C-alpha cells in the first residue's frame, strides 16, 4: 500500500529514491509486480482512451479560448493585418507598463498573440464566428466525456476485452485502413465540399441548412451518371477573393494545382479531391486482410513465404509475425518511426505548400510550426530506436528468429556499426573541413578561395520538378518532354507558374551554403543513427559485456573492472543520441529560419553570401536577429517581447543546469548529503522535525535522465523564443 | 463514502457535520445578503463605480484589463477575506468548546436524518440561497433587486 | 465573463495544485 504498490521492491526501498523510481516506473506496465499479458493489454487500452480524451480536451480548450477571449471575428475581416489572439493574460505580477504593452490586437485587455496558426486553420476550414468555435469546443468536450466513460467501461469485468481480440491483427488493420483513414478522409472531403468551399465562396452553410443547400447546382446527378467532369467544370477564377462570391466558381473537385493567388494556399477544391481520392485508395486497401469471410490475406503466411531463393536473406521473414504480434515494443518502435517520418514530412510540406488561407504571409506561425514539427519528428525517431533497443533486450527470441532476416541484423551488426561510423566520420570530417576552409579564406580577406560546391543534383531535381532558372531544361522544365506534355491540362498550367514564381517557398533557390548545410544535416542524421543502431544491436551483449540482456535495458554500469563500463546499458545509447537529435534538428531549424528570414526580407544574397562560412551563421543569423529578442526589456523600458526575452534566458538557465547532472555524478552529492544529514540531525530545534525516507543522492540513471531533461527543455525554450520573437521584430 | 476513506475519516464529504457547517454558513450568508442590501440602500459603500488603480491595489486592481473592480468590491473583499482569516483560525486553531470542522478521530458523525432545529433552518437557508441565485440567473435581475 | 479569470485562475493554480501536492505527499507517506 506504500506508493509503489506495483513494485514491492521500491515499497521496501527506505530512501528517497523510492518516490523517484515509483513515479518513473509508473507507466512501465510490462515489468510491474503480478502483471499478466491480458491485464497489461487492458490497462494499455484504457490509458489510450484517457489519452485521446486529453487530446480532445486540449483541442476544445484552444477552441473555447479563441472563441471567448480571441479576436477571431475581427481577424476574419482583415486577416493580413489583425494579429490573432491566443488567450487573455491573468497575472497579478504585471505592472502598468507591461499592461499597456501586452494590451494589443484590438482588445482592451492584455493578450497573447497566437503563433499556432489555429486562426488560419479554422478560417480555411469554415469557421467565421465565435459561436461556431464555442460549439466545436462543446462538442469536443462531449467527445472527451464519452472517451473517459469508454475508458472506465473497458476495465469492467463483463466489458474487459480479451487477449485474442487484442492480437487480432487482420481485423484491426482492415478497420484502421478502411474506416479510420479511409472513411474519415471521405468525411473530411465531404466537409470541405459542403461547408468550406461554400464558405470560401460566400455561402453560410451550417447544421440548420446544410441539409437543404446543394453543394453543386447539378447535385448528385453527375456522380450517378458518371459525368464527373461536371464537378471540375467552372473552377475558381484567378481573380477570386477568399470569403466572397465575386470571382467564385461552382466546381467542387478540381486538380488545378499551384496556389490560390489571393491567399497563396492550395485550392480547397484540390484538397477536397485529394481527400476523396486518397480515401478511395485506403478503403480499398482496407479489404486486404482475412476477417471472418475467407477472402483476404494471412499476414503470417505472407511473412513465412517471403524468403528469397537459395537462402539469400537466411530464412527470410519467418518468425517476424510471431515476434511483432507478441512484442509490444516492436510495434511501438515501428509506430514511432513511421510517425516521426510523417511529422518530418508535414514539417517539410506545410511550408512549401501552404494549405491555410493567408498563412504564407504569417511568418511567425510558419517558423513556429516548422520548428515544432521537426523537433517532435526527432523525438519520435529517437523513441522508435529506443523501443527497438528495448525489444532487442527484452522481447527478442533467437529460437523463433533462427537464421531470420532480423537475426542477420545482429549477425552483421559489427559491419553495420563500423560502416555507420565510417560515413559519419567522412561526412563530419569533410563538412567541417570545407566550412573551416571557407571561414579562413573569408577571414584572410580573400573570399575567392572559398571551395563552393554547387548542389547540382538538388538543382537538377528542382529543374525536373519545374524550375527554370537553372537552365537544365530536363523533364518538366523542358516543355516538349513526355513528362511535361502528358500532364499539361490537369496541374502543370498552375504548378509551373507556382514553382517559377519567386514569391513562394516552393522549391527555394539553393546554393553552396545549401550544399554544405545539407551535408551537415546528413552528418547529424548518420551519427544519431549510429548511436541509436549501436545501442539497439549491442543491447543484448557486447565483447565487454556478453550478458547484458541479463541486466536488462537501463542499468547504471558493470563497475570499474575491465577498464570501466560507463554508459554501457543501451539506455545510455538513447541518452547520448538525444543530444545528437537535438543537434541535427537545431541545424535543420537554423537553416530553415535563416533562409526563410532572408527570403521573406527580400535579401537572399545574405544567405547565399554569408552561409558558406560559419561566422556568417554566427553573425547574420544569430547575432543580427537576436537584437529584437534581447531588447524585449532594457533599462529604458519594456516591449511585448519581454516575455520572449525572459523565456530565452529561462531556457538558457535550464540548458545550463542540465550540465550539472550531466557532468557531476553521484558520489560527490551522496557524501554532501551525508554532511547535510549530519547537520540536520545534530542541530537543535530542527532535529525534532525528521524525515521518513532517508535522503540520498540521485541514482546514476536518474541523474542522466534529469540532466538530459534540463538539456532538452532548455533547447526548446531558447529556440522557441528566438524563433518567435526575432521573426516578429523583423517583420 | 467508503471509496474515499481519507475524506470520510475527517467528515469531509456527504456527512452530517459538513451539512451542519454548510447550513450555518448559508444562514450567515443570507444574513450577509440582507445586510449588504440594506447597506447599499443606505450610504456605506463608496459610490460612483470608481475603478481601482495600480497605485492603490496594484496588479490585483486590473486597472487597464477590463472587469471594473470597484472600491465597494474591494471593501467587501477585505471583509470576506477577514472572514476567511478568522475561519482558518477557528478551524485549525483550538476548538473553543464548540464544533470541530473536522470530525476528529474519536467522534463519529451524528446520526443522519435545538441542533435539529439548526439543521432544519440550515437546509431552509441553503434552499433559499439556491433559489435566489437561480431566480437571478433566469430573470437576469440583480440578486439584491430580487430579494428586494 | 471577465469575472471568471479572477475566480478560476487562482483557484486552479494556487489552491488546487497545493491541495494535490498535499494529498500526494500524504498518500506516498502511508504505511
Amino acid at each position: 500500500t506504500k506508493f509503489p504498490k506495483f513494485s514491492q521492491a521500491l515499497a521496501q526501498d527506505p530512501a528517497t529514491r523510492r518516490i523517484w523510481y515509483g513515479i518513473a516506473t509508473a507507466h512501465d506496465l510490462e515489468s510491474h509486480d503480478g502483471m499478466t499479458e491480458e491485464n497489461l493489454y487492458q490497462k494499455i487500452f484504457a490509458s489510450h482512451f484517457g489519452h485521446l480524451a486529453i487530446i480532445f480536451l486540449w483541442t476544445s480548450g484552444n477552441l473555447f479560448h479563441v472563441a471567448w477571449q480571441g479576436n477571431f471575428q475581427q481577424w476574419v475581416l482583415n486577416p493580413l493585418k489583425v494579429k490573432p489572439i491566443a488567450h487573455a493574460i491573468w497575472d497579478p505580477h504585471f505592472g502598468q507598463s507591461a499592461i499597456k504593452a501586452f494590451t494589443r490586437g484590438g482588445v482592451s485587455y492584455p493578450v497573447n498573440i497566437a503563433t499556432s496558426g489555429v486562426y488560419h486553420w479554422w478560417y480555411t476550414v469554415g469557421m467565421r464566428t465565435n459561436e461556431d468555435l464555442y460549439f466545436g469546443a462543446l462538442g469536443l468536450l462531449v467527445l472527451s466525456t464519452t472517451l473517459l466513460f469508454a475508458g472506465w467501461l473497458h476495465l469492467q469485468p463483463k466489458f474487459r476485452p480479451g487477449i485474442a481480440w487484442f492480437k487480432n491483427n487482420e481485423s484491426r488493420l482492415n478497420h484502421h485502413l478502411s474506416g479510420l483513414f479511409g472513411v474519415s478522409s471521405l468525411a473530411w472531403s465531404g466537409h470541405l465540399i459542403h461547408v468550406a468551399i461554400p464558405e470560401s465562396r460566400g455561402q453560410h452553410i451550417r447544421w440548420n441548412n446544410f441539409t437543404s443547400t446543394l453543394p453543386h447546382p447539378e447535385g448528385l446527378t453527375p456522380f450517378f451518371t458518371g459525368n464527373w467532369g461536371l464537378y471540375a467544370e467552372n473552377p475558381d477564377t484567378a481573380q477570386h477573393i477568399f470569403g466572397t462570391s465575386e470571382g467564385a466558381g461552382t466546381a467542387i473537385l478540381t486538380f488545378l494545382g499551384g496556389f490560390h493567388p489571393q491567399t497563396q494556399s492550395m485550392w480547397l477544391t484540390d484538397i477536397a479531391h485529394h481527400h476523396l481520392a486518397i480515401a478511395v485508395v485506403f478503403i480499398f486497401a482496407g479489404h486486404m486482410y482475412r476477417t471472418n469471410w475467407g477472402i483476404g490475406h494471412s499476414m503470417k503466411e505472407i511473412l513465412d513465404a517471403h524468403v528469397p531463393p537459395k537462402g539469400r536473406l537466411g530464412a527470410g521473414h519467418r518468425g517476424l509475425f510471431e515476434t511483432i504480434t507478441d512484442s509490444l515494443h516492436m510495434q511501438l518502435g515501428l509506430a514511432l518511426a513511421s510517425l516521426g517520418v510523417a511529422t518530418s514530412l508535414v514539417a517539410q510540406h506545410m511550408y512549401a505548400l501552404p494549405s491555410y488561407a493567408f498563412m504564407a504571409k504569417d511568418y511567425v506561425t510558419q517558423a513556429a510550426l516548422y520548428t515544432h514539427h521537426q523537433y517532435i519528428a526527432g523525438f519520435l525517431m529517437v523513441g522508435a530506436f529506443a523501443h527497438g533497443a528495448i525489444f532487442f533486450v527484452r522481447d527478442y527470441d533467437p529460437e523463433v528468429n533462427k537464421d531470420n532476416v532480423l537475426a542477420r541484423m545482429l549477425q552483421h551488426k559489427e559491419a553495420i556499426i563500423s560502416h555507420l561510423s565510417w560515413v559519419s566520420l567522412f561526412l563530419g570530417f569533410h563538412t567541417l573541413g570545407l566550412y573551416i576552409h571557407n571561414d579562413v579564406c573569408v577571414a584572410f580577406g580573400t573570399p575567392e578561395k572559398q571551395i563552393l560546391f554547387e548542389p547540382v543534383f538538388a538543382q537538377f531535381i528542382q529543374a525536373a520538378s519545374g524550375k527554370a532558372l537553372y537552365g537544365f531544361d530536363v523533364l518538366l522544365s523542358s516543355s516538349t518532354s513526355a513528362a511535361s506534355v502528358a500532364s499539361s491540362k490537369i496541374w502543370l498550367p498552375g504548378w509551373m507558374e507556382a514553382i517559377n514564381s519567386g514569391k513562394n517557398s516552393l522549391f527555394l533557390t539553393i546554393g553552396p551554403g545549401d550544399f554544405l548545410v545539407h551535408h551537415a544535416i546528413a552528418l547529424g542524421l548518420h551519427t544519431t543513427t549510429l548511436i541509436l543502431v549501436k545501442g539497439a544491436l549491442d543491447a543484448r551483449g557486447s565483447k565487454l559485456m556478453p550478458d547484458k540482456k541479463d541486466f536488462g535495458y537501463s542499468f547504471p554500469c558493470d563497475g570499474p573492472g575491465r577498464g570501466g563500463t560507463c554508459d554501457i546499458s543501451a539506455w545510455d545509447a538513447f541518452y547520448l543520441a538525444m543530444f545528437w537529435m537535438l543537434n541535427t534538428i537545431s541545424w535543420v531549424t537554423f537553416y530553415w529560419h535563416w533562409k526563410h528570414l532572408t527570403v521573406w526580407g527580400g535579401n537572399a544574397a545574405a544567405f547565399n553570401e554569408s552561409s558558406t562560412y560559419i561566422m556568417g551563421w554566427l553573425r547574420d543569423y544569430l547575432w543580427l536577429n537576436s537584437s529584437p529578442l534581447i531588447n524585449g526589456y532594457n533599462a529604458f523600458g519594456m516591449n511585448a517581447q519581454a516575455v520572449w526575452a525572459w523565456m530565452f534566458l529561462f531556457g538558457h538557465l535550464i540548458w545550463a543546469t542540465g550540465f550539472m547532472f550531466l557532468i557531476s555524478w553521484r558520489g560527490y552529492w551522496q557524501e554532501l548529503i551525508e554532511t547535510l544529514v549530519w547537520a540536520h540531525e545534530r542541530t537543535p530545534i530542527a532535529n525534532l522535525v525528521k524525515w521518513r525516507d532517508k535522503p540520498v543522492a540521485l541514482s546514476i540513471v536518474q541523474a542522466r535522465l534529469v540532466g538530459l531533461a534540463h538539456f532538452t527543455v532548455g533547447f526548446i525554450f531558447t529556440f522557441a523564443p528566438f524563433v518567435i520573437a526575432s521573426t516578429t521584430g523583423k517583420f | 463514502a467508503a471509496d474515499y476513506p481519507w475524506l470520510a475519516k475527517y467528515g469531509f464529504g456527504p456527512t452530517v457535520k459538513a451539512e451542519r457547517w454548510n447550513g450555518r454558513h448559508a444562514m450567515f450568508g443570507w444574513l450577509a445578503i440582507l445586510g449588504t442590501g440594506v447597506a447599499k440602500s443606505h450610504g456605506w459603500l463608496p459610490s460612483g463605480d470608481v475603478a481601482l488603480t495600480y497605485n492603490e491595489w496594484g496588479g490585483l486592481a486590473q486597472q487597464g484589463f477590463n472587469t471594473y473592480i470597484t472600491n465597494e468590491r474591494a471593501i467587501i473583499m477585505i471583509a470576506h477575506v477577514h472572514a476567511l482569516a478568522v475561519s482558518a483560525a477557528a478551524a485549525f486553531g483550538p476548538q473553543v468548546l464548540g464544533d470541530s470542522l473536522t470530525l476528529l478521530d474519536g467522534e463519529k458523525d451524528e446520526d443522519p436524518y435545538t441542533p435539529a432545529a439548526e439543521m432544519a433552518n440550515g437546509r431552509m437557508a441553503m434552499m433559499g440561497i439556491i433559489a435566489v441565485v437561480l431566480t437571478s440567473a433566469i430573470s437576469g435581475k440583480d440578486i439584491l433587486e430580487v430579494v428586494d | 465573463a471577465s469575472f471568471l479569470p479572477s475566480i478560476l485562475t487562482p483557484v486552479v493554480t494556487l489552491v488546487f495544485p497545493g491541495l494535490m501536492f498535499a494529498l500526494f505527499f500524504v498518500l506516498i507517506e502511508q504505511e
Binding site: 490497462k43 484504457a46 490509458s47 482512451f49 484517457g50 480524451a53 480536451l57 473555447f64 472563441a67 471567448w68 465565435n130 459561436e131 464555442y134 469546443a137 462543446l138 468536450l141 462531449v142 472527451s144 466525456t145 473517459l148 466513460f149 475508458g151 472506465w152 476495465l155 469492467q156 | 471509496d3 440567473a137 | 465573463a1 471568471l4
Partner: peptide
C-alpha cells in the same frame, strides 16, 4: 460574443468530464 450562460454550460460539461476522469483514473489505479 460568447455569453455567460454559454460559458457556464460549457463549464458544467467540463465538470461532468472531470468526474468521469476521476472515475477512469480510479479504475486504472485498481
Amino acid at each position: 460574443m460568447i455569453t455567460d450562460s454559454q460559458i457556464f454550460f460549457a463549464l458544467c460539461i467540463a465538470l461532468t468530464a472531470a468526474v468521469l476522469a476521476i472515475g477512469l483514473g480510479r479504475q486504472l489505479y485498481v
